[PDB]
Amino acid sequence: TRKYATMKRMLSLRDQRLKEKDRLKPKKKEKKDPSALKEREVPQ
Amino acid sequence: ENRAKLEARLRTLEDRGIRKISGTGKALAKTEKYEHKSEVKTYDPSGD
């Protein structure tokens, strides 16, 4: 029940109450789904 | 006779299924902490 290496609750850098410039990173990993169609713009 | 026996067994099966979800019912309500009432008025017979 006891916890160790605890830290006080503070603001995170990924909060959207911060501005976009101030925000750290969206921290999103994108995976190309195999079922997903591949679309590209190729001028003729 | 065979038909009526199945409905007797089917009724019991439905009740047993309900009993499993509902519970045995043996448990009771749990006890609660008590805090004394404060600023209680009293009567002093010394004044008499």
Binding site: - | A4, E7, A8, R11
Partner: protein, 149 residues
């Protein structure tokens, strides 16, 4: 019936049942059973009922008449009472709320009845009844538990 022999009256009825084969035979069969009890006795009605119990176009008045004749007889064989109601409930049990209610009161009010069967009849009534008839049976029984009937 008024001014002819009883054998000719049965002859007329048998010709009628051959001619009419569809839904119009419903009224024909009902008057045939009523004549049998008047011209004959309980035994004559039994023979007529046995012959016509399989001609499928029916009405609930056919079975209510047969049960009524059983009640008037002194024997009142309670097993035959159930045997008629099961046949009636086989045909019209899916839609007739009143027939189920009448069955339940027979087990209660009849001196030879077994009211411990009322638990099963109510349970059976719920499943065969469909749609709006299911609601009406519940209200009628709850009306029956109170004295308003």
């Amino acid at each position: 019936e008024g001014a002819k022999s009883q054998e000719d009256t049965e002859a007329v009825f048998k010709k009628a049942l051959l001619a009419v084969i569809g839904a119009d035979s419903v009224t024909l069969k009902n008057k045939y059973l009523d004549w049998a009890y008047r011209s004959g006795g309980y035994k004559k009605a039994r023979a007529v009922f046995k012959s016509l119990q399989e001609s499928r176009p029916f009405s609930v008045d056919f079975f209510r008449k047969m049960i009524q004749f059983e009640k008037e007889q002194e024997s009142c064989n309670m097993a035959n009472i159930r045997e008629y109601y099961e046949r009636a409930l086989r045909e019209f049990g899916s839609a007739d709320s009143d027939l189920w209610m009448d069955y339940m009161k027979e087990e209660l009010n009849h001196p030879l009845g077994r009211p411990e069967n009322c638990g099963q009849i109510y349970w059976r009534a719920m499943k065969m009844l469909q749609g709006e008839s299911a609601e009406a049976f519940v209200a009628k029984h709850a009306m029956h538990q109170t004295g308003h009937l």
